[PDB]
Amino acid sequence: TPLVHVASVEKGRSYEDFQKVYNAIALKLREDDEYDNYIGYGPVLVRLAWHTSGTWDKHDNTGGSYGGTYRFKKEFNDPSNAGLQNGFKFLEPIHKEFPWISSGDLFSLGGVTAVQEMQGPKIPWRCGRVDTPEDTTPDNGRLPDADKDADYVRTFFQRLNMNDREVVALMGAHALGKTHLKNSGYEGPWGAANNVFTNEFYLNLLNEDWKLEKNDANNEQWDSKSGYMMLPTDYSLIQDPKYLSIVKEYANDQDKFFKDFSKAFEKLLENGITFPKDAPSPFIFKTLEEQGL
Numbered sequence: 001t002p003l004v005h006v007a008s009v010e011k012g013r014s015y016e017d018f019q020k021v022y023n024a025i026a027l028k029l030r031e032d033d034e035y036d037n038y039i040g041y042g043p044v045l046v047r048l049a050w051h052t053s054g055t056w057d058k059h060d061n062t063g064g065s066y067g068g069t070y071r072f073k074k075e076f077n078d079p080s081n082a083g084l085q086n087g088f089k090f091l092e093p094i095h096k097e098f099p100w101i102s103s104g105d106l107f108s109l110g111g112v113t114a115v116q117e118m119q120g121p122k123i124p125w126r127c128g129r130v131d132t133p134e135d136t137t138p139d140n141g142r143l144p145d146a147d148k149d150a151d152y153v154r155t156f157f158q159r160l161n162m163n164d165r166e167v168v169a170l171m172g173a174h175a176l177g178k179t180h181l182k183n184s185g186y187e188g189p190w191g192a193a194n195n196v197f198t199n200e201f202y203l204n205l206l207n208e209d210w211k212l213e214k215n216d217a218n219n220e221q222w223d224s225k226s227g228y229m230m231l232p233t234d235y236s237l238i239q240d241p242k243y244l245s246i247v248k249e250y251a252n253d254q255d256k257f258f259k260d261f262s263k264a265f266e267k268l269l270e271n272g273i274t275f276p277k278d279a280p281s282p283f284i285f286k287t288l289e290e291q292g293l
């Protein structure tokens, strides 16, 4: 019988409490700048937010961000999550300092903080995820494969209640970070300015000269002479005519991409959660720059 998960505000907490958590994550992002050849922790925190939310199944309300179940071995041991231990370790001192925040609130807030501090759009964020027990952890295998085509992508994301525009917008997060051969069997960045959130993913898809190559793990990926790559699922966005139209739209309208990403990413992070009518409004956190910090 599917589970209603009702958001429950951490007792007595308000916007200022969560802004302090934001700020601690943001200051640590600035301090621990050497990680991953000076990419920093921003991208891995966005990937962590996505992987902890992307297990959701709309059919039975299992998985999703609510329960914070990545803290249990079945999930941090998911082969699809290889590498995310670095993001968890980053967040450990944050949780120690703010032990009142739930695990799902912390994982999701880490992704919002990373996007914003990397000059991305504001992402409204709601509190109130509540930790759930070990037997609520979803089985491995709910996150998407990278070696597939547009039809796979489209069908996959129906389980997360995402439409074509939402899918294409969310995939623009691949402007950030890179693939690492030891984690995923893919190697290389999608672009150049990979710790700055921009619409570069879409520009690179359209404007680079891509060649289908095998990497050192014997997997196919698309490579450019600029030193960028696209996964088969990324490249599928220009193979499918419906996705291609949307790629072109975001390549030509930075503001539109930002607005659509913000909405889709909030939705991703909120899937599965019931917000009571009297819950607080979503919070829009100030960046460190906006605060003079």
Ligand SMILES: C=CC1=C(C)c2cc3[nH]c(cc4nc(cc5[nH]c(cc1n2)c(C)c5C=C)C(C)=C4CCC(=O)O)c(CCC(=O)O)c3C
Binding pocket: 043, 044, 046, 047, 050, 082, 083, 144, 145, 146, 153, 170, 171, 173, 174, 176, 177, 178, 179, 180, 181, 183, 184, 185, 186, 231, 233, 265
């Ligand atoms: C078809 C859909 C998707 C597939 C197959 C997928 C593929 C990948 N995404 C990766 C990393 C990444 N994924 C990322 C955000 C997202 N990625 C998402 C959608 C997908 N992501 C969405 C949705 C995201 C958030 C909104 C980020 C930012 C990284 C880079 C992480 C890092 O450590 O640099 C990796 C590489 C992991 C590694 O360290 O080697 C793969 C294989």
